[PDB]
Swiss-Prot record:
Residues 121-137 have a biased composition (Basic and acidic residues). This protein is located at the 30S-50S ribosomal subunit interface and may play a role in the structure and function of the aminoacyl-tRNA binding site. This is Large ribosomal subunit protein bL19. SUPFAM superfamilies: Translation proteins SH3-like domain. One of its GO terms (biological process) is translation. Keywords: Ribonucleoprotein, Ribosomal protein. PANTHER family: LARGE RIBOSOMAL SUBUNIT PROTEIN BL19M, RIBOSOMAL PROTEIN L19. HAMAP family: Ribosomal_bL19. The keyword Electron transport does not apply.
Length: 137
RNA sequence: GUGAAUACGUUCCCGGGCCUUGUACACACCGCCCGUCACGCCAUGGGAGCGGGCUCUACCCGAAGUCGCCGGGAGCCUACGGGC
């Protein structure tokens, strides 16, 4: 009874963890499986993460990509069993949670609102490489 | 066979001839010619609007690119002053 919410978690065997961390205000790419008509592809889709809707298992994130002169957005679930690889590319300062203004105001004016959150860079650059020596010995 | 009147004269009506005049007339005034209207054809201006081409003013976004800066709380060659 008093486990009412543990029940769902128990139902969460479909849980992954090789996902690297990130937070709204930075760009990233995924790699996805699409029924490519006859077969299936690894559709590398790189963009900016916009929104993050957290709810334990069914936590979703929305990625936006400007392709061929068209502002697109793409919504993915975190534990989706379709993410082969997924690797960040850059990180940036937040100042706000969501950011439904990159919709309207998409240009170079976002190359100055993003800015390089170099703090987490060193953080990423730390365990990425300096901890490799903590494997090869 | 017998056997008259008057023309003073050309002002005026008619015909013809000649001179001059005019013309747009010339199978020659039964001529020539004008404009509306009616019919068909032809381009055409105006004209509620329709379709394009070109140019200009202002503002927004802005690929590749040279040039000025930072090149730093990283990447990298180090030729460790530096260069990508
Ligand atoms: Mg006309």
């Amino acid at each position: 009874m008093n486990r009412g919410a543990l029940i769902k978690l128990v139902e969460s065997r479909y849980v992954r963890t090789d996902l690297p961390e990130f937070r709204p205000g930075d760009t990233v790419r995924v790699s996805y499986k699409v029924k490519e008509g006859n077969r299936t592809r690894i559709q590398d889709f790189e963009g900016i993460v916009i929104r993050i809707r957290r709810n334990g298992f069914n936590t979703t994130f929305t990625v936006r990509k400007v392709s061929y002169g068209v502002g697109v957005e793409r919504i993915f679930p975190l534990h989706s069993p379709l993410i082969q690889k997924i690797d960040i590319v850059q990180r940036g300062r937040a100042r706000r949670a969501k950011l439904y203004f990159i919709r309207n105001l998409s240009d170079r004016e976002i190359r100055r609102k993003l800015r390089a959150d170099r703090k987490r860079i060193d953080k990423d650059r730390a365990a990425e490489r300096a901890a490799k020596e903590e494997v090869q010995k």
